[PDB]
Amino acid sequence: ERPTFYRQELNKTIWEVPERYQNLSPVGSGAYGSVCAAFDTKTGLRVAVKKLSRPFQSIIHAKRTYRELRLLKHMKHENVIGLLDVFTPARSLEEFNDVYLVTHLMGADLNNIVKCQKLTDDHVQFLIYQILRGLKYIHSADIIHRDLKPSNLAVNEDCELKILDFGLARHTDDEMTGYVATRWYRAPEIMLNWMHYNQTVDIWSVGCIMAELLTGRTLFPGTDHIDQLKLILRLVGTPGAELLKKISSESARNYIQSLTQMPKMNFANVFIGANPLAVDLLEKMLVLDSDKRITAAQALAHAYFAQYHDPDDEPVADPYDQSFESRDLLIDEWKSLTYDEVISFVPP
């Protein structure tokens, strides 16, 4: 049955939610859609409620909406934020114009963590293990988060981590410009468009993240795209002939060849005092050639995680059909597909 809804204005926006959600309080608004913290009286959970902005304006917006609902509906793993609820005040496709997504509410992201506690090696072990446990699950559904950063990792009091806020759009050039954390964790091949990327870009992100946890500092705080590439190549060394071939972009490849050849540095001396196993793992993750990076599944079996590794409790995901990504449709067609997904939802 259709629950009853109530209305209220939350910053030039009239929110219409089911009675079960009480005490809505904003936390941030963007080109995506404003988000409110709220208490779901039906479950006793602190929840984040996102009201998508003009979900079915452009063909682009209509697809993004569908994309995000399909993705959130699929994620069902302890280390990934799934969907708790999705709803709309509309009573038919005809009325359907607004979409609200509900998920667990993030108390503190990983940054929040790196600036308070003094992460011990064990903490690093447990935090990175969880990210890799969730990535394995994600990459197995052939889903690429492609935007892993401290701010996209929720961590509770018990240091339990969940991966959220997947890459569902395409950051504007401006977003990625300058001295910004929105680019420091990006693999080089994606940041400079060397070639068509794959799930391996996330492992590079995990690498940058893990280094920051151990040193408490950003690994590659480039002031811009170029500076960051230099910061990266100074550590992992310039690319050899084999990697150069794999770089499709002739411009990008030609640019790299203009740089003086540098050798990969000794990570033991960069991460002074870091657990030798941690050092070794960082070397297998921060490999310039994505084909040779360690995979999430391979990393979970690494000696550094011996303490937490358990082959029987690192589940893969159900097949995720995203054939729609390559499909061209109209706004109304994307809206109905979206609608059906809303009317077919089932809480956990």
Ligand SMILES: COc1cc2ncnc(Nc3cccc(SC)c3)c2cc1OC
């Ligand atoms: C305390 O701060 C915040 C807490 C949040 N808790 C969970 N998800 C968020 N964002 C988000 C990302 C992707 C999909 C959805 S749908 C529920 C919502 C949040 C945003 C915040 O700040 C802006």
